[PDB]
A paper describes a structure:
We report here a detailed structural and functional analysis of the RadA protein from S. pneumoniae, which uncovers several key properties of this HR effector encoded in nearly all bacterial species and in some eukaryotes. In addition, like DnaB proteins, we show that RadA assembles into a ring-shaped hexamer and is a functional DNA helicase that loads onto ssDNA and translocates in a 3′ direction along it to unwind dsDNA.
In the structures of RadAP and RadAFL, the P domain (residues 290–453) forms a ring with six-fold symmetry. In both RadAFL and RadAp, the hexameric structure is primarily maintained by the extensive surface of interaction between adjacent P domains (940–976 Å). The internal diameter of the P domain (15 Å) can accommodate ssDNA but not dsDNA. In addition, the stability provided by the robust self-association of RadA P domain into a hexameric ring allows RadA to promote incorporation into the genome of transforming ssDNA over long distances.
Numbering used by the authors:
A (entry chain A), C (entry chain A), F (entry chain A): 277 to 452
B (entry chain B), D (entry chain B), E (entry chain B): 276 to 452
Write the structure that this text describes.
């Protein structure tokens, strides 16, 4: 947790932490977004470290289901440190980072997000959810948002608050 | 198996459908998702993940020319849930139903799944290993599966699941919606 | 033949059968086309299972040499079943399928087409023409169109009518 | 060999030419085809198969700047007959002649073939293995072959075929058309 | 090492900066060059060689949103000198300084080098193997190196070189320009 | 030298010779350029045998630092004979060939150019400069332009005039 909190400027917006996997190892990674209005041509969508199309899908869901008006906004996204983010579980952190920059409201650098985001705005389960809460807890994170359907039949550790969520709107209201 | 899709399906959520696709020789159940919304400015946007961009374009042209859905002025975002790569003719029907579901604002039944190639004249053409697909659907608790009508000839159906043979995309939309 | 005739809706237009090769084995494949007028931007040309550029060439030849006005038409092409069509011999079937959709006139599902199409509208010879007429005959096709220059020095089987052609216009007049 | 091209060549068919190209160490005869027609709407279309798109663009700029053919407002479709992949400098001359033939509406002689790289100042530059190319052309019954004039120095010509050494693209167009 | 850059640097030449990057485990010194000039017609041009096109776009958006440089109406051409491929987060700071130098028409000191990843909120984030980078800079006679301020914790500095830990891109521009 | 001089038409403009490397062997290659005004859309930049982006950079430097107005000019570039030119040292020859076509003034086919060109118009050193002057001399070239900073500590052969240069403007004035 500490290496992310030292790198987070005070009240810096447009970033979020994800618990992702390299092989079978769980890794913490920071997702960053910068949204500003488009001037000419198509709205700019430039990414590094995460798929361009995945970001487009996430921005369409955020507009249609959470009302953020992103169609006329340029978006620049990146994963800190050059970590390749290529799995469904990173959707939520990417969505939160975008909303954070759009809302100009920061996230807490001791919290992290795990979940696939469907086109109906739902937060879908992901694999190896137990290592994710464990790695997030073990490295000193206080709160982790996960798909609530991933919580069924699981033993929560008390070191970290585990917030089960089901929709992107529900997440935005808790976080912002 | 089947309710893991019913537990992930929000109540009355539109624009999704289940396909029985194949990875090697193993049959896999996968959810196709679509988001069709009117274009505001510029050209209509078409973004996909997990399935071929051109295949979706072809399917949308068929749905317009043969099922009357006016998709040329609508943006379309499509994805396969869970990062499953959908790369075979058999997924055409599920993609088409997912698109029609989002366009019609009417949901599909999360205990039903769709299998079939879609031709440019709107016909549902046969696919390989239809038996494993119907079996996998029954195995995992699905109640109904739509399959190519010509795939049924000389085949043994499981008792657990209704198998509806279809021949045209319009016939599917009217039974489903 | 029968597996193609059962899949062909009654009077369904914009499709045709080709006798192509997988390695040294001759295979029957159905080519499909859908032509409708273009609205904005460039005329749409979307393909799967066959090369985009090959279709563009075929559509330019059909306009310049057979008068079909395709420059203001969108075209969607595909090979049924996901079969990759990647050889000169498929030109004729692709051209006929396009003309069938453009003319709104169907082809006979018991007939098939074999030939390379040149830029002057000519039907050029192809390799292993004998297996192609044989495989077409053996699987119950009644008629096959082939390059007439491929017929020189060959023994025709009586099970199938073999129509030697030399130009795309001559083919369109026989078929439509 | 040579008449297999003359038998496939419609009477007075324009926009084609023969090249002696190389696959590994074997020389192959191939027909280059061009279709040049005026643009109706939008930007001029350039579609190719069997030869590099950029190489055709370069050749068309040379033909315009050095041979006066106005190609900027013309669509061009090019292909190599038989699916032969043309990927070497020696094919430039045949491609240029095929383009000029379609533009001028004047045919080439199907018993003639062209070998040479085309420079941006319109010069015909030497190519490798000129002897196998001229020999293969004679072997297969061709009557005339145009080759780079500098490729002839110190070389033994076959008696069966006229070998015309050329130096500029304009010189070729005037001898050929 | 250091003067080979000072000997190649024209007097008062703007738009260049030195980075300590890594090839495998070996640290390499490389010069990043930028050419920022106002757009005359059409959309702003962005051409790069030796470094990722998207990385430069991201860096230019950060410099505009966080350092006030108006780059949306400026063409940008970027390259790494010597054909060195720059493909790691640590080069962000040098690229940003090179861009700001060309935009501000103010040169950098060719005996200084820059190391750091640049975040979208303008922060300078830590990089790997900071010790070899600072050591290689000293080894080759550089007088000053800017590094991520958080990379210094628990590290032994060489006496030969000033090590300036920085935290924001604005702080760097004001110290450097 | 002789094989390049025989292929050079009298007063033919827009070409130049470079001493490049295939592995560790030094090779002579001819770079060609053709610049004409752009009509519609973006100015045409078509290349073969050398990188498209490298040519764009070189044309931007030639405009900003030597005043040649190339932004409204189409450019076609190629290496003679299909030789792949993929190293910093070819910059100078490419720049000279473009300027030659733009200025409508030829280069001498017995001269060659070696050097990387920086964004400030400077001619930067290249590796194995000694083989380059040697191969240029051995094959009968009379003059070679090289980066002057490459000359420090080197023994010049008298068979060939070696012109050390530092800027693209200085080169253009000597050559044109």
């Amino acid at each position: 947790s500490q290496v992310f909190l030292e790198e987070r400027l005070d009240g810096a917006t447009g970033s979020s932490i994800v618990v992702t996997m390299e092989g079978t190892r769980p890794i913490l990674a920071e997702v960053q977004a910068l949204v500003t209005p488009t001037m000419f041509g198509n709205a700019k969508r430039t990414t590094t470290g995460l798929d361009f199309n995945r970001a487009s899908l996430i921005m369409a869901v955020l507009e249609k289901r959470a009302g953020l008006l992103l169609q006329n906004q340029d978006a620049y996204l990146k994963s800190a440190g050059g970590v390749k983010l290529d799995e469904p579980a990173i959707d939520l952190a990417v969505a939160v980072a975008i909303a954070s920059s759009y809302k100009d409201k920061p996230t807490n650098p001791q919290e992290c997000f795990v979940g696939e985001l469907g086109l109906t705005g739902e937060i879908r389960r992901v694999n190896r959810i137990e290592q994710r809460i464990n790695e997030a807890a073990k490295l000193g994170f206080t709160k982790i948002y996960v798909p609530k359907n991933s919580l069924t039949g699981i033993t929560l550790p008390k070191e970290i608050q585990v917030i089960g969520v089901t929709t992107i709107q529900e997440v935005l209201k808790k976080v912002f």
